[PDB]
Amino acid sequence: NFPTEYFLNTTVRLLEYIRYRDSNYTREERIENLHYAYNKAAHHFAQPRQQQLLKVDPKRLQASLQTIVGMVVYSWAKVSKECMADLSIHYTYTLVLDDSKDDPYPTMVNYFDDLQAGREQAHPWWALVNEHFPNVLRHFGPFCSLNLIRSTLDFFEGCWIEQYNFGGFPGSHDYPQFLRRMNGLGHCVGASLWPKEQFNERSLFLEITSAIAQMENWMVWVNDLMSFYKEFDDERDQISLVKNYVVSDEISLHEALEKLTQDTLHSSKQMVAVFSDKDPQVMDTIECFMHGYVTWHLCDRRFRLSEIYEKVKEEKTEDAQKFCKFYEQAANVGAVSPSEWAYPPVAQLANV
Amino acid sequence: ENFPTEYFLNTTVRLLEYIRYRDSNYTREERIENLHYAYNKAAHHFAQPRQQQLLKVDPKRLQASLQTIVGMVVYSWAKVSKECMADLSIHYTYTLVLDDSKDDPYPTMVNYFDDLQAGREQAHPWWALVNEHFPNVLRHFGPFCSLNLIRSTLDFFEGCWIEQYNFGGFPGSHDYPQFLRRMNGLGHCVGASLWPKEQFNERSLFLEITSAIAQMENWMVWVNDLMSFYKEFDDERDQISLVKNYVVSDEISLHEALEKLTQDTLHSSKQMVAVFSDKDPQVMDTIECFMHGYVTWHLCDRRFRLSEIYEKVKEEKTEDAQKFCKFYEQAANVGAVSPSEWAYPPVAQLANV
Ligand SMILES: CC(C)=CCC[N@@H+](C)[C@@H]1CC=C(C)CC1
Ligand SMILES: CC(C)=CCC[N@@H+](C)[C@@H]1CC=C(C)CC1
Ligand SMILES: [Mg+2]
Numbered sequence: 001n002f003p004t005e006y007f008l009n010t011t012v013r014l015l016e017y018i019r020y021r022d023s024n025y026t027r028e029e030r031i032e033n034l035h036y037a038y039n040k041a042a043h044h045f046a047q048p049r050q051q052q053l054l055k056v057d058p059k060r061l062q063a064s065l066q067t068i069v070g071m072v073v074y075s076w077a078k079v080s081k082e083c084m085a086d087l088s089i090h091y092t093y094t095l096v097l098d099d100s101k102d103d104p105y106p107t108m109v110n111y112f113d114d115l116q117a118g119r120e121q122a123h124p125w126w127a128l129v130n131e132h133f134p135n136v137l138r139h140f141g142p143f144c145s146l147n148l149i150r151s152t153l154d155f156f157e158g159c160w161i162e163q164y165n166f167g168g169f170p171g172s173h174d175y176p177q178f179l180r181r182m183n184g185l186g187h188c189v190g191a192s193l194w195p196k197e198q199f200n201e202r203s204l205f206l207e208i209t210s211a212i213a214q215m216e217n218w219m220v221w222v223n224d225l226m227s228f229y230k231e232f233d234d235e236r237d238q239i240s241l242v243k244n245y246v247v248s249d250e251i252s253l254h255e256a257l258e259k260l261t262q263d264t265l266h267s268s269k270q271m272v273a274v275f276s277d278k279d280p281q282v283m284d285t286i287e288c289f290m291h292g293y294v295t296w297h298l299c300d301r302r303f304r305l306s307e308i309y310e311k312v313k314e315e316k317t318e319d320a321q322k323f324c325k326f327y328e329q330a331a332n333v334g335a336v337s338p339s340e341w342a343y344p345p346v347a348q349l350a351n352v
Numbered sequence: 353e354n355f356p357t358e359y360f361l362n363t364t365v366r367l368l369e370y371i372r373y374r375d376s377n378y379t380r381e382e383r384i385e386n387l388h389y390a391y392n393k394a395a396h397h398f399a400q401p402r403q404q405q406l407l408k409v410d411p412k413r414l415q416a417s418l419q420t421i422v423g424m425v426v427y428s429w430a431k432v433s434k435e436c437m438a439d440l441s442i443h444y445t446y447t448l449v450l451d452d453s454k455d456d457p458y459p460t461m462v463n464y465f466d467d468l469q470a471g472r473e474q475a476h477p478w479w480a481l482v483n484e485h486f487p488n489v490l491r492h493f494g495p496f497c498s499l500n501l502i503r504s505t506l507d508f509f510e511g512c513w514i515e516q517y518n519f520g521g522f523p524g525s526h527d528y529p530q531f532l533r534r535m536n537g538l539g540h541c542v543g544a545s546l547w548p549k550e551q552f553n554e555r556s557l558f559l560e561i562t563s564a565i566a567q568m569e570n571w572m573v574w575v576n577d578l579m580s581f582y583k584e585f586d587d588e589r590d591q592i593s594l595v596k597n598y599v600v601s602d603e604i605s606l607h608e609a610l611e612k613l614t615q616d617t618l619h620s621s622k623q624m625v626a627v628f629s630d631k632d633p634q635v636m637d638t639i640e641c642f643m644h645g646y647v648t649w650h651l652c653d654r655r656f657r658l659s660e661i662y663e664k665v666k667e668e669k670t671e672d673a674q675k676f677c678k679f680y681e682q683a684a685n686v687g688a689v690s691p692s693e694w695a696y697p698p699v700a701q702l703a704n705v
């Protein structure tokens with residue numbers, strides 16, 4: 001049974017400590033970027049090649065795409081429309097894999113030789129991601145690029161490990177976070193925040209590196225907390241930082257949630273301490289990302305947090321009320337109807 | 353000021369007890385057979401004209417580096433084949449050498465992905481040599497382990513990039529220190545290179561391997577930080593290290609920073625045993641031998657100067673001081689080997705031929 005009571009307690013503390021407040025866009029801008037990113041991505045995923053090598057159920061691709069276009073647009077508020085679109089494609093390729101069930105082993109036997117030789121990878125996912133990667137990379141300098149490349153490779157290994165539905169040997173205190181960094185795309189996300197068009201990678205090398213290092217944790221932990229609801233009675237998940245803290249450190253689900261919350265509140269505290277007296281343009285990007293990322297969690301269908309707002313809409317219990325106020329705050333800014341941007345469906349473009 | 357000899361001794365002794373440091377069926381003669389085999393293959397590789405011209409390293413430094421790495425590999429990867437130790441000695445010597453360059457990677461990384469995707473030789477000479485040699489290392493492993501080596505080496509490259517900035521982290525940037533240490537730790541490379549497919553079934557042992565990688569990453573780097581603490585204590589050239597970065601980033605004292613490292617190191621040690629004690633025998637043995645050899649390597653290799661500590665507490669009636677000396681003599685007994693017995697001829701001589 002889902003610990004609704006604690007779920008509220010934990011989420012509320014987080015939203016209050018960070019003083020959640022999304023002011024990233026005017027409703028017209030939001031809609032304008034959502035459509036742009038979706039349109040370029042939709043046309044991309046509708047091509048016969050992408051349609052045939054990417055093994056995904058149409059209704060699932062469509063949902064994944066709209067979920068990512070939101071994530072990108074809602075959290076990368078300061079980058080260009082082109083950048084948002086190209087990033088939306090990359091992170092859609094990753095989300096599709098994130099929910100998948102496949103054995104990479106057979107198609108990874110000649111990974112390095114094919115890579116070094118320039119031959120197309122045998123694993124369809126890599127074939128599509130690597131072929132499209134330059135469209136994402138043209139937006140960044142060499143350092144950030146390397147970070148995106150590494151993180152995507154890490155993420156791939158992370159989905160691989162998860163295929164074994166293994167949560168760690170009891171007593172393996174390092175396994176939980178080892179896996180979370182693997183599947184976190186932390187460095188990919190943190191480095192994709194600095195397009196060379198807006199930032200000089202050599203002038204801000206230290207601030208960017210720091211942002212990557214620190215934002216990696218804040219970023220993953222926030223999702224571990226916000227996405228705790230959709231992940232639970234879900235088979236594909238189960239193997240999560242929270243539930244692995246349970247199996248590996250042999251503690252109660254209750255203690256795992258509290259542990260995660262303290263890490264996050266701490267990660268949040270230091271984000272502020274370090275990036276307050278720094279380059280304004282840098283702070284702005286971090287700020288927009290942090291608040292926007294939270295708005296996306298409270299709004300997007302993938303996380304089904306409305307199924308908790310409705311089942312807690314009543315009953316006054318301090319947390320329950322504080323949660324619904326936040327849920328509404330975000331709902332008022334990012335609860336944009338799909339029919340206003342996510343059109344036409346990918347399936348329709350594919351069969352044109 | 354003044355090295356915490358007491359605290360240091362206690363921590364090391366506890367470390368060696370927690371891991372069950374003890375004698376092994378690995379002799380001195382076998383070590384010498386392995387040392388010379390790995391050294392000989394590596395020396396011939398680095399003495400080739402191509403390697404000699406793309407790897408801008410001072411010859412004496414290359415010579416000393418190769419000898420440090422061969423020792424590390426032959427002593428810690430005790431269960432793998434001679435070829436495997438040899439090929440890993442080459443890879444790890446390449447990585448250790450990358451630290452000798454100040455040259456900004458930026459200009460050479462502008463087209464990293466495009467050259468990689470197209471199959472054109474990388475612009476950064478280091479990658480050119482390393483990627484060209486990698487298959488010799490990879491043939492010894494399954495696809496999963498391979499991927500780990502590849503990632504960790506890519507991580508290591510970025511780590512060296514970052515280190516060129518001599519940056520210990522902004523005060524209050526608590527996550528910076530460990531983020532950096534993992535970056536250039538090679539943990540996943542090390543951890544996964546302990547399971548040759550010839551001796552292990554990556555698929556059947558997937559869970560124990562993934563677990564060893566996870567736990568070995570932190571053990572391997574923290575033990576090195578701990579044992580390197582003496583050699584880096586007064587060294588004003590070494591300005592950024594996990595411990596010094598904890599000081600700058602967390603805003604605590606060198607002492608408190610050392611305490612943090614100790615607690616992590618010791619804790620990591622207990623869980624290593626507590627997790628692999630009952631698991632598969634061949635696996636626990638590889639893990640068991642890695643920890644012991646890794647420690648022996650530190651105690652015997654002169655780069656860490658631990659003999660200076662041994663030679664200073666050699667005659668004190670303290671308990672720790674004695675257990676330390678005892679341990680050290682166990683190490684020296686089986687590991688203190690003269691380079692003239694295996695490391696010959698010098699790479700330079702092979703180069704002129
Ligand atoms: C998007 C996918 C495929 C997986 C979720 C992994 N998380 C670590 C997120 C990755 C993207 C952002 C913006 C934040 C953290
Ligand atoms: C080899 C030395 C000097 C120290 C041990 C620390 N590890 C993190 C090493 C980093 C570089 C290599 C090649 C292997 C592992
Ligand atoms: Mg995932």
Ligand SMILES: [Mg+2]
Nearest residue numbers: 098099231237
């Ligand atoms: Mg998931």
Ligand SMILES: [Mg+2]
Nearest residue numbers: 223224227231
């Ligand atoms: Mg999640």
